[PDB]
Amino acid sequence: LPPGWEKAMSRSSGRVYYFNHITNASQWERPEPARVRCSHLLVKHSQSRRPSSWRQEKITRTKEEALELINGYIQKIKSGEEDFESLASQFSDCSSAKARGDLGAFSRGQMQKPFEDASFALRTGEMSGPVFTDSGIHIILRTE
Ligand SMILES: O=C(O)CN(Cc1ccccc1)C(=O)c1nc(-c2ccccc2)[nH]c1C(=O)O
């Protein structure tokens, strides 16, 4: 299977699913360019490198509370109840929020390493699960 993918078994159902340990993506169905383009939604927490954003001068949520927020945004995006662009614009603690989280194109050697690795392991159109860096917790959408 492509880079990072392993076969696993569901806790509730017993059905096979697939888990990517590089993007933290998981999906039911069976699953490198010089440059990729991604958007993200960042949720900072009290242990972030810079616990401050356009949304909130002092970010005080714990890492666990950030992960809970991230997982709720993933659920809404996957259900189609909200789209990624809209939750990024509204809720991302990154300054790219004002561009629907779009970061433009980048190559390896530019981003923090867990962000880069996840970005380059996603398929075009594919969204990560929670990705952790010193900025905080991310949802990454690879758009090209
Ligand atoms: O201030 C910055 O520009 C970067 N920081 C603080 C920081 C500083 C050094 C290392 C890691 C994080 C952030 O926490 C941050 N990271 C991002 C980020 C992370 C991954 C991809 C794109 C943007 N955005 C932000 C932001 O405030 O707007």
Coordinates of N, CA and C and ligand atoms in Angstrom, one line a residue:
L1 N 0.9 -1.2 0.0 CA 0.0 0.0 0.0 C 0.9 1.2 0.0
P2 N 0.4 2.4 -0.5 CA 1.3 3.6 -0.5 C 1.9 4.0 0.8
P3 N 2.9 5.0 0.8 CA 3.7 5.3 2.0 C 2.9 5.6 3.2
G4 N 3.1 4.9 4.3 CA 2.5 5.1 5.6 C 1.3 4.3 6.0
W5 N 0.8 3.4 5.0 CA -0.5 2.8 5.2 C -0.4 1.4 5.7
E6 N -1.2 1.1 6.7 CA -1.3 -0.2 7.3 C -2.8 -0.6 7.4
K7 N -3.0 -1.9 7.3 CA -4.3 -2.6 7.5 C -4.6 -2.8 9.0
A8 N -5.8 -2.5 9.4 CA -6.1 -2.5 10.8 C -7.5 -3.1 10.9
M9 N -8.0 -3.3 12.2 CA -9.3 -3.8 12.4 C -10.1 -2.9 13.3
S10 N -11.3 -2.7 12.9 CA -12.1 -1.7 13.7 C -12.6 -2.3 15.0
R11 N -12.5 -1.4 16.1 CA -12.9 -1.8 17.5 C -14.4 -2.1 17.6
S12 N -15.3 -1.4 16.9 CA -16.7 -1.5 17.0 C -17.2 -2.7 16.2
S13 N -16.8 -2.7 14.9 CA -17.5 -3.4 13.9 C -16.7 -4.7 13.6
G14 N -15.4 -4.7 13.9 CA -14.5 -5.8 13.4 C -14.2 -5.8 11.9
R15 N -14.7 -4.7 11.2 CA -14.3 -4.6 9.8 C -12.9 -4.1 9.6
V16 N -12.2 -4.5 8.5 CA -10.9 -4.0 8.1 C -11.0 -2.4 7.7
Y17 N -10.0 -1.7 8.1 CA -9.9 -0.3 7.6 C -8.5 0.0 7.5
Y18 N -8.1 1.2 7.1 CA -6.7 1.5 6.7 C -6.3 2.7 7.5
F19 N -5.1 2.8 8.0 CA -4.6 3.8 8.9 C -3.3 4.2 8.3
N20 N -3.1 5.6 8.2 CA -1.8 6.1 7.8 C -1.1 6.7 8.9
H21 N 0.1 6.1 9.3 CA 0.7 6.6 10.5 C 1.5 7.9 10.3
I22 N 1.6 8.3 9.0 CA 2.3 9.6 8.7 C 1.3 10.7 8.7
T23 N 0.1 10.5 8.2 CA -0.9 11.6 8.1 C -2.0 11.6 9.2
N24 N -2.0 10.4 9.9 CA -3.1 10.0 10.9 C -4.4 9.9 10.2
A25 N -4.4 9.8 8.9 CA -5.8 9.6 8.2 C -6.2 8.1 8.5
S26 N -7.6 7.9 8.5 CA -8.1 6.6 8.5 C -9.3 6.6 7.6
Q27 N -9.5 5.5 6.9 CA -10.5 5.3 5.8 C -10.9 3.8 5.7
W28 N -12.2 3.5 5.3 CA -12.6 2.2 5.0 C -12.0 1.5 3.8
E29 N -11.9 2.2 2.7 CA -11.4 1.6 1.4 C -9.9 1.4 1.3
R30 N -9.4 0.4 0.6 CA -8.0 0.2 0.4 C -7.4 1.4 -0.4
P31 N -6.4 2.1 0.2 CA -5.7 3.3 -0.4 C -5.2 3.0 -1.8
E32 N 6.2 10.2 -5.2 CA 6.3 11.5 -4.5 C 6.7 12.7 -5.4
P33 N 5.8 13.8 -5.5 CA 6.0 15.0 -6.3 C 7.1 15.9 -5.7
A34 N 7.7 16.8 -6.5 CA 8.7 17.8 -6.0 C 8.0 18.8 -5.1
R35 N 6.7 19.1 -5.4 CA 6.0 20.2 -4.7 C 4.6 19.8 -4.4
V36 N 4.0 20.3 -3.3 CA 2.6 20.1 -3.1 C 2.0 21.4 -2.6
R37 N 0.7 21.5 -2.8 CA 0.0 22.7 -2.2 C -1.0 22.2 -1.2
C38 N -1.0 22.8 0.0 CA -1.9 22.4 1.1 C -2.5 23.6 1.7
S39 N -3.7 23.4 2.3 CA -4.3 24.3 3.3 C -4.3 23.6 4.6
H40 N -4.4 24.3 5.7 CA -4.5 23.7 7.0 C -5.4 24.5 7.9
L41 N -5.8 23.8 9.0 CA -6.5 24.5 10.1 C -5.7 24.1 11.3
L42 N -5.3 25.1 12.0 CA -4.4 25.0 13.2 C -5.2 25.3 14.4
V43 N -5.1 24.4 15.4 CA -5.7 24.7 16.7 C -4.5 24.7 17.7
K44 N -4.2 25.9 18.3 CA -3.1 26.1 19.2 C -3.5 25.6 20.6
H45 N -2.5 25.4 21.5 CA -2.9 25.1 22.9 C -1.9 25.8 23.8
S46 N -2.0 25.5 25.1 CA -1.1 26.3 26.1 C 0.4 25.9 25.9
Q47 N 0.6 24.7 25.4 CA 2.0 24.3 25.2 C 2.5 24.6 23.8
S48 N 1.7 25.2 22.9 CA 2.3 25.7 21.6 C 3.5 26.7 21.8
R49 N 4.4 26.7 20.8 CA 5.5 27.6 20.7 C 5.1 29.1 20.9
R50 N 4.0 29.4 20.2 CA 3.5 30.8 20.3 C 2.0 30.8 20.6
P51 N 1.6 30.6 21.9 CA 0.2 30.5 22.3 C -0.6 31.8 22.2
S52 N -0.7 32.3 20.9 CA -1.4 33.5 20.7 C -1.9 33.5 19.3
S53 N -3.0 34.1 18.9 CA -3.4 34.2 17.5 C -4.3 35.4 17.2
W54 N -4.6 35.6 15.9 CA -5.6 36.6 15.6 C -6.9 36.4 16.4
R55 N -7.2 35.1 16.7 CA -8.5 34.8 17.4 C -8.5 35.1 18.9
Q56 N -7.3 35.0 19.5 CA -7.3 35.0 20.9 C -5.9 35.4 21.4
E57 N -5.8 36.5 22.1 CA -4.5 37.0 22.5 C -3.7 36.0 23.4
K58 N -4.4 35.4 24.3 CA -3.8 34.4 25.2 C -4.5 33.1 25.0
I59 N -3.8 32.1 24.4 CA -4.5 30.8 24.2 C -4.2 29.9 25.4
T60 N -5.3 29.4 26.0 CA -5.1 28.7 27.3 C -5.7 27.3 27.3
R61 N -6.3 26.9 26.2 CA -6.8 25.5 26.1 C -5.7 24.6 26.2
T62 N -6.0 23.4 26.8 CA -5.0 22.4 26.9 C -4.8 21.7 25.5
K63 N -3.7 21.0 25.4 CA -3.5 20.1 24.2 C -4.7 19.1 24.1
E64 N -5.2 18.5 25.2 CA -6.3 17.6 25.0 C -7.6 18.3 24.5
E65 N -7.8 19.5 25.0 CA -9.0 20.3 24.5 C -8.8 20.7 23.0
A66 N -7.6 21.0 22.7 CA -7.3 21.3 21.2 C -7.6 20.0 20.4
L67 N -7.2 18.9 20.9 CA -7.4 17.7 20.1 C -8.8 17.4 19.9
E68 N -9.6 17.6 21.0 CA -11.0 17.4 21.0 C -11.7 18.4 19.9
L69 N -11.3 19.6 19.9 CA -11.7 20.6 18.8 C -11.4 20.1 17.4
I70 N -10.2 19.8 17.2 CA -9.7 19.2 15.9 C -10.6 18.0 15.5
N71 N -10.8 17.0 16.4 CA -11.6 15.8 16.1 C -13.0 16.2 15.7
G72 N -13.6 17.2 16.4 CA -14.9 17.7 16.1 C -15.0 18.3 14.7
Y73 N -13.9 19.0 14.3 CA -13.9 19.7 13.0 C -13.7 18.6 11.9
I74 N -12.8 17.6 12.1 CA -12.7 16.5 11.2 C -14.1 15.8 11.0
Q75 N -14.8 15.6 12.1 CA -16.1 14.9 12.0 C -17.1 15.7 11.1
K76 N -17.1 17.0 11.3 CA -18.0 17.9 10.5 C -17.6 18.0 9.1
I77 N -16.3 17.9 8.8 CA -15.8 18.0 7.4 C -16.2 16.6 6.8
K78 N -15.9 15.5 7.5 CA -16.1 14.3 6.8 C -17.6 14.0 6.6
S79 N -18.5 14.4 7.5 CA -19.9 14.3 7.3 C -20.5 15.2 6.2
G80 N -19.7 16.2 5.8 CA -20.2 17.2 4.9 C -21.1 18.3 5.5
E81 N -21.2 18.2 6.8 CA -21.9 19.2 7.5 C -21.2 20.6 7.4
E82 N -19.9 20.7 7.4 CA -19.2 22.0 7.2 C -18.1 21.7 6.2
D83 N -17.7 22.7 5.4 CA -16.6 22.4 4.7 C -15.3 22.9 5.3
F84 N -14.2 22.3 4.8 CA -12.9 22.6 5.4 C -12.6 24.1 5.4
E85 N -12.8 24.8 4.3 CA -12.5 26.2 4.1 C -13.2 27.1 5.0
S86 N -14.4 26.7 5.3 CA -15.2 27.5 6.2 C -14.8 27.3 7.7
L87 N -14.4 26.1 8.1 CA -13.9 26.0 9.5 C -12.5 26.5 9.6
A88 N -11.7 26.5 8.5 CA -10.4 27.1 8.6 C -10.5 28.6 8.8
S89 N -11.4 29.3 7.9 CA -11.6 30.7 8.0 C -12.0 31.2 9.4
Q90 N -12.9 30.4 9.9 CA -13.5 30.7 11.2 C -12.6 30.4 12.4
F91 N -12.0 29.2 12.4 CA -11.4 28.7 13.6 C -10.0 28.4 13.6
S92 N -9.3 28.5 12.5 CA -7.8 28.3 12.5 C -7.1 29.4 13.2
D93 N -6.2 29.0 14.1 CA -5.3 29.9 14.8 C -4.1 30.3 14.0
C94 N -4.1 29.9 12.7 CA -3.0 30.4 11.9 C -3.4 31.7 11.2
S95 N -2.5 32.6 10.9 CA -2.8 33.7 10.0 C -3.3 33.4 8.6
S96 N -3.0 32.2 8.1 CA -3.6 31.8 6.8 C -5.1 31.5 6.9
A97 N -5.7 31.6 8.1 CA -7.2 31.5 8.2 C -7.8 32.5 7.2
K98 N -7.3 33.7 7.0 CA -7.9 34.7 6.1 C -7.8 34.3 4.6
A99 N -7.0 33.3 4.3 CA -7.0 32.7 3.0 C -7.7 31.3 2.9
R100 N -8.6 31.0 3.8 CA -9.3 29.7 3.9 C -8.2 28.6 4.2
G101 N -7.2 29.0 4.9 CA -6.1 28.1 5.3 C -5.1 27.8 4.3
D102 N -5.2 28.3 3.1 CA -4.3 28.0 2.0 C -2.9 28.5 2.3
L103 N -1.9 27.6 2.2 CA -0.5 27.9 2.3 C 0.3 28.1 1.0
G104 N -0.4 27.8 -0.1 CA 0.4 27.8 -1.4 C 1.2 26.6 -1.5
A105 N 2.1 26.6 -2.5 CA 2.9 25.4 -2.8 C 4.2 25.4 -2.1
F106 N 4.7 24.2 -1.7 CA 6.0 24.2 -1.0 C 6.7 22.9 -1.3
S107 N 8.0 22.8 -1.1 CA 8.7 21.6 -1.4 C 9.2 21.1 -0.1
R108 N 9.9 19.9 -0.1 CA 10.5 19.5 1.2 C 11.6 20.4 1.6
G109 N 11.9 20.5 2.9 CA 12.9 21.3 3.5 C 12.4 22.7 3.9
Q110 N 11.1 22.9 3.9 CA 10.5 24.3 4.3 C 9.7 24.2 5.5
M111 N 8.8 23.2 5.7 CA 7.9 23.2 6.9 C 8.5 22.4 8.0
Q112 N 7.8 22.5 9.2 CA 8.2 21.6 10.3 C 8.0 20.2 9.8
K113 N 8.8 19.3 10.3 CA 8.9 18.0 9.7 C 7.6 17.1 9.8
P114 N 6.9 17.1 10.9 CA 5.6 16.3 10.9 C 4.6 16.9 9.9
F115 N 4.6 18.3 9.8 CA 3.7 18.9 8.8 C 4.1 18.5 7.4
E116 N 5.4 18.6 7.1 CA 5.9 18.3 5.7 C 5.6 16.8 5.4
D117 N 5.9 15.9 6.3 CA 5.8 14.5 6.0 C 4.3 14.2 5.8
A118 N 3.4 14.7 6.6 CA 2.0 14.5 6.3 C 1.6 15.0 4.9
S119 N 2.0 16.3 4.6 CA 1.6 16.9 3.4 C 2.0 16.1 2.1
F120 N 3.3 15.6 2.1 CA 3.8 14.8 1.0 C 3.3 13.3 1.0
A121 N 2.7 12.9 2.0 CA 2.1 11.5 2.1 C 0.6 11.5 1.6
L122 N 0.0 12.7 1.7 CA -1.4 12.8 1.3 C -1.5 12.7 -0.2
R123 N -2.7 12.2 -0.7 CA -3.1 12.2 -2.1 C -3.7 13.6 -2.4
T124 N -3.7 14.0 -3.6 CA -4.4 15.3 -4.0 C -5.8 15.1 -3.6
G125 N -6.3 16.1 -2.8 CA -7.7 16.1 -2.4 C -7.9 15.5 -1.0
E126 N -6.9 14.7 -0.5 CA -7.0 14.0 0.8 C -6.7 14.9 1.9
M127 N -7.3 14.6 3.0 CA -7.2 15.3 4.2 C -6.5 14.4 5.3
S128 N -5.7 15.0 6.1 CA -5.0 14.3 7.2 C -5.9 14.1 8.4
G129 N -5.5 13.3 9.4 CA -6.1 13.4 10.7 C -5.3 14.4 11.5
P130 N -5.4 14.4 12.8 CA -4.7 15.4 13.6 C -3.2 15.2 13.4
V131 N -2.5 16.3 13.2 CA -1.0 16.3 12.9 C -0.5 17.2 14.0
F132 N 0.5 16.7 14.8 CA 1.0 17.5 15.8 C 2.3 18.2 15.5
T133 N 2.5 19.4 15.8 CA 3.8 20.1 15.7 C 4.0 21.0 16.8
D134 N 5.1 21.7 16.9 CA 5.2 22.7 18.0 C 4.3 24.0 17.8
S135 N 3.7 24.2 16.6 CA 2.7 25.2 16.4 C 1.4 24.8 17.1
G136 N 1.1 23.6 17.1 CA -0.2 23.1 17.7 C -0.7 21.9 17.0
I137 N -2.0 21.8 16.8 CA -2.5 20.6 16.2 C -3.1 21.0 14.9
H138 N -2.9 20.2 13.8 CA -3.3 20.6 12.4 C -4.3 19.6 11.8
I139 N -5.2 20.1 10.9 CA -5.8 19.3 9.9 C -5.2 19.8 8.6
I140 N -4.7 18.9 7.8 CA -4.0 19.3 6.5 C -4.9 18.8 5.4
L141 N -5.2 19.7 4.4 CA -5.8 19.3 3.1 C -4.8 19.5 2.0
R142 N -4.5 18.4 1.3 CA -3.6 18.6 0.2 C -4.5 18.9 -1.1
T143 N -4.2 20.1 -1.7 CA -5.1 20.5 -2.8 C -4.4 20.4 -4.2
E144 N -3.1 20.3 -4.2 CA -2.4 20.0 -5.5 C -1.1 19.2 -5.2
Ligands
LIG1 O1 4.6 32.6 14.3 C1 4.8 31.8 13.4 O2 4.8 32.2 12.1 C2 5.0 30.3 13.6 N1 4.3 29.9 14.9 C3 5.2 30.0 16.1 C4 6.4 29.0 15.9 C5 7.7 29.5 15.8 C6 8.8 28.6 15.6 C7 8.5 27.2 15.4 C8 7.1 26.8 15.5 C9 6.1 27.7 15.7 C10 3.1 29.5 15.0 O3 2.6 29.2 16.0 C11 2.4 29.2 13.6 N2 2.7 28.1 12.8 C12 1.9 28.2 11.7 C13 2.0 27.3 10.7 C14 2.4 26.0 10.9 C15 2.5 25.1 9.8 C16 2.2 25.5 8.5 C17 1.9 26.8 8.3 C18 1.8 27.7 9.3 N3 1.2 29.4 11.7 C19 1.5 30.0 12.9 C20 0.8 31.3 13.3 O4 1.0 31.8 14.5 O5 0.2 32.0 12.5

